[PDB]
TrEMBL record:
The name this protein goes by in its record: Genome polyprotein
Purpose of the protein: Associates with and induces structural rearrangements of intracellular membranes. Triggers host autophagy by interacting with host BECN1 and thereby promotes viral replication. Participates in viral replication and interacts with host DHX9. Displays RNA-binding, nucleotide binding and NTPase activities. May play a role in virion morphogenesis and viral RNA encapsidation by interacting with the capsid protein VP3. Covalently linked to the 5'-end of both the positive-strand and negative-strand genomic RNAs. Acts as a genome-linked replication primer.
Domain called RdRp catalytic: residue spans: 234-352
Residues that bind Mg(2+) 2: D238, D240, D339
Subcellular location, record wording: Host cytoplasmic vesicle membrane; Host endoplasmic reticulum membrane; Host nucleus; Virion
Domain of life: Viruses
Similarity comment: Belongs to the picornaviruses polyprotein family.
Subunit structure, as described in the record: Interacts with 3B-1; this interaction allows 3B-1 to binds 2 polymerases and act as a primer. It also allows the recruitment of the RNA-dependent RNA polymerase to host membranes. Interacts with 3B-2; this interaction allows 3B-2 to act as a primer. Interacts with 3B-3; this interaction allows 3B-3 to act as a primer. Forms homooligomers.
Annotated binding of Mg(2+) 1, by residue: D63, E293
RNA sequence: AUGGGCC
RNA sequence: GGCCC
């Protein structure tokens, strides 16, 4: 978004730490073009004269402003999408109890007991268990006091910046393109869950093309559902954004929140108010305090669902800004945050749509880059969604999420000390869809050192997961 | 080092 | 704990 202020405060918030990721035996063998993200300025792998802390805020280039006519247009799309959405989810969106916000419900995971609390708790050595009782689902004085404030709508907060200790393409490491997480205070997360926790549960349970969202899906078993759905259309588009999160303009955010979370849909009046506190935020990084306008704080605030809803409304608004008579049935789409798959039988011109996404401050481009702009005819077996391809399992005939072996190799070449065993059994679950031969190759560097799940066991597990009867069929 | 999914 | 946004 738009960085309006850049002040320097005396007290300092720490981030620059060492990476917990370490090279495994696989690394020496596979030799991936991947590595831990740069977390320091003194990182020897960084390109000369490349200032880390400067490349982290280079995503905030502007809070694009919309005219009155586009705003009224956007509002129309938001209300149309809100309509479909709640039409499918229902309208039992009353607040959750504090107990229910902490433990969650069906469709909603409980809160994480041992993660960061945000500010200003980080300036007091307090963990999450020190503020909240994740057992009995209870909160302490500070929190409760903070809840009243939020009830009063007089709550003020700041985001704590964290560099993401993940593996990335070496090109992005060297370019110091480490991604960051805007850790919000723990009370904010909780209150958000109270205000919109039921809604999020419903979204997770109802994931699919109908609501245009994959949040809460399980690739292993939903690829079949999503795959058959999309192979059903003439055109399919793998659309990429750049800085989706950052490029949400206040206009757009403010209109979605107003349109999707109205009290008539069952929401407590504070739902709209809490979300709106994500627009203009103050971000604390070491000795720096940075006030930003526009953009959704990445990681802490039903971030995925908000990013997904917006994505749906962006597509409907672009199409409508270019074509006449466009409705939600004109096309079909599933998204997960910024990740998106769009499909239609009309020769929709996504090359012409670019400017219209620009009118929102968003930059769309084809996934398959080598191709000059968006083409037509592409089928679902060409796109990526959630870093997985849609391939046909020749054993069952079901679609299966296949990850690129280069990616898998990367994942297997770095690990957090003392978790290699768990991680493997975890990655095996993903590798099984590559096939027997690839599966063997991938884990070969680990054989005789860890327990590698057999291809057969994970395969049988999958077949049942995806379609229990298909398993029974193989027995009749 | 996180929101949220999925194991 | 691990992956995916
Ligand atoms: Mg502004
Ligand atoms: Mg994609």
């Amino acid at each position: 978004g738009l960085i309006v202020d850049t002040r320097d405060v005396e007290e300092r918030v720490h981030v620059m730490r060492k990476t917990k990721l370490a090279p495994t035996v696989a690394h020496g063998v596979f030799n991936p073009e991947f590595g831990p993200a740069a977390l320091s300025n003194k990182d020897p792998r960084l390109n000369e004269g490349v200032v880390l802390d400067e490349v982290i805020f280079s995503k905030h280039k502007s809070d694009t402003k919309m005219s009155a006519e586009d705003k009224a247009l956007f509002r129309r799309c938001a209300a149309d999408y809100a309509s479909r959405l709640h039409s499918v989810l229902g309208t039992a969106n009353a607040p959750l109890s504090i107990y229910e916000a902490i433990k969650g419900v069906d469709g909603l995971d409980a809160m994480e007991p041992d993660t960061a609390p945000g500010l200003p708790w980080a300036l007091q050595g307090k963990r999450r268990g020190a503020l909240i009782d994740f057992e009995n689902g209870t909160v302490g004085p500070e929190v409760e006091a903070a809840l009243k404030l939020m009830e009063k709508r007089e709550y003020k907060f700041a985001c704590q910046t964290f560099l993401k200790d993940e593996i990335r393409p070496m090109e992005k490491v060297r370019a110091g393109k480490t991604r960051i997480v805007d850790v919000l205070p723990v009370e904010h997360i909780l209150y958000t869950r109270m205000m919109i926790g039921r809604f999020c549960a419903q979204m997770h349970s109802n994931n699919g093309p109908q609501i245009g969202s994959a949040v809460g899906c399980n690739p292993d078993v939903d690829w079949q559902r999503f795959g058959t759905h999309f192979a059903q259309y003439r055109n399919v588009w793998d659309v990429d954004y750049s800085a989706f999160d950052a490029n949400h303009c206040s206009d757009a955010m403010n209109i979605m929140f107003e349109e999707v979370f109205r009290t008539e849909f069952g929401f407590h009046p504070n739902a709209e108010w809490i979300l709106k506190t994500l627009v203009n935020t103050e971000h604390a990084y070491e000795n720096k305090r940075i006030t930003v306008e526009g953009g959704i704080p990445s990681g802490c605030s039903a971030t995925s669902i908000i990013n997904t809803i917006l994505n749906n409304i962006y597509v409907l608004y672009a199409l409508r800004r270019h074509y006449e008579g466009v409705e939600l049935d004109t096309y079909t789409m599933i998204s997960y945050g910024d990740d998106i798959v769009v499909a239609s039988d009309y020769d929709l011109d996504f090359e012409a749509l670019k400017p219209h996404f620009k009118s929102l401050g968003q930059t769309i481009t084809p996934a398959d880059k080598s191709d000059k702009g968006f083409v037509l005819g592409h089928s679902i077996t060409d796109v990526t969604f959630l870093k997985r391809h849609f391939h046909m399992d020749y054993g069952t005939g079901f679609y299966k999420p296949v990850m690129a072996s280069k990616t898998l190799e990367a994942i297997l070449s770095f690990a957090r000390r003392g978790t290699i065993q768990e991680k493997l059994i975890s990655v095996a679950g993903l590798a099984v869809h590559s096939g027997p031969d690839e599966y063997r190759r991938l884990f070969e560097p680990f054989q005789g050192l860890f327990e590698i799940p057999s291809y057969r066991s994970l395969y049988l597990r999958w077949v049942n997961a995806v379609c229990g009867d298909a398993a029974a069929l193989e027995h009749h």
